[PDB]
Design a protein around this ligand. Structure first.
Ligand SMILES: CC(=O)Nc1cc(S(=O)(=O)O)cc2cc(S(=O)(=O)O)cc(O)c12
Ligand SMILES: CC(=O)Nc1cc(S(=O)(=O)O)cc2cc(S(=O)(=O)O)cc(O)c12
Lengths: 146, 146
């Protein structure tokens, strides 16, 4: 009736501080502005599917997901995984519309937050591998809850 | 698979040059950036329904329509007309999201175009009632086709 539709925007961003799993998949729920992030070793169709399985457990099942035309997003595999879930897959709108901004602003806020927290803990370079998960979870908490 | 979802934004704007039917209903198709406009004497639930019946004949049936919470848009009547068509009705997204900009930019472009054309025809004030329809159709053509 009157309330925003459940549409996500998803993207991958590189963050070397999180190596070897430095590919962060980030999903913004445009209905709630909630942010979900997971880390991956590579940007593959399967990484994107694992990320969305996690996002679905946390946010529920969306009506549609917007991405760019990255191959992990347009592969037969990913097309079939989304069909299996009954989730529509869409993309940017034409007419010189420059970029799904929200997930892009999120990428930036996220990388800043990771940096601030890391440097606070005394990691000026790569975050030790055993510390990464809690730090990523803490940045996600900070970006969503207050 | 990969292409933009069929979501419209609809709004009413007042344009005294078009009196007595000075309420212009404007619909932008975010998938194609096409603009549909009709004129009305009042902003009622029925005016909104007549506008969308026209927009559907011209653009096809959308998956959802975004409006503000104006009463012509949230009435039981309009809620039922949209249900009858199987069209979802939604609204702005939270998080300090200030306004469905696209249909708002359209309103502005439309009123400018009407002014330019009217003054070109020598109407510096109200457009004579018998001339209004073709002039409105000409502004719509100008905003969409080239
Ligand atoms: C459903 C809907 O209205 N979506 C949208 C509304 C507006 S707005 O300017 O009107 O706020 C802008 C949008 C921009 C893009 S993108 O091409 O940059 O990715 C995609 C959308 O889906 C947009
Ligand atoms: C489906 C989708 O992505 N929609 C959208 C994408 C973006 S964008 O900044 O990411 O381009 C901005 C949007 C803004 C609004 S509104 O509150 O101003 O009306 C509504 C949308 O629906 C938007």
């Amino acid at each position: 009736g009157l309330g925003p539709l459940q549409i996500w925007q998803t993207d991958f961003t590189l963050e070397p501080r999180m190596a070897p799993r430095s590919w962060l998949a980030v999903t913004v729920d445009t209905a709630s502005s909630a942010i979900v992030v997971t880390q991956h070793g590579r940007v593959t169709s399967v990484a994107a599917q694992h990320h969305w399985a996690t996002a679905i457990a946390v946010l529920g099942r969306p009506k549609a997901i917007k991405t760019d035309n990255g191959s992990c997003f347009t592969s037969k595999s990913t097309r079939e995984w989304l069909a299996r879930w009954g989730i529509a897959h869409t993309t940017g709108i034409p007419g010189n519309s420059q970029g799904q901004a929200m997930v892009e602003r999120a990428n930036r806020l996220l990388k800043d937050k990771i940096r601030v927290l890391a440097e606070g803990d005394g990691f000026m370079k790569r975050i030790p591998t055993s510390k990464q998960g809690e730090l990523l979870a803490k940045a996600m908490y900070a970006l969503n809850h207050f």
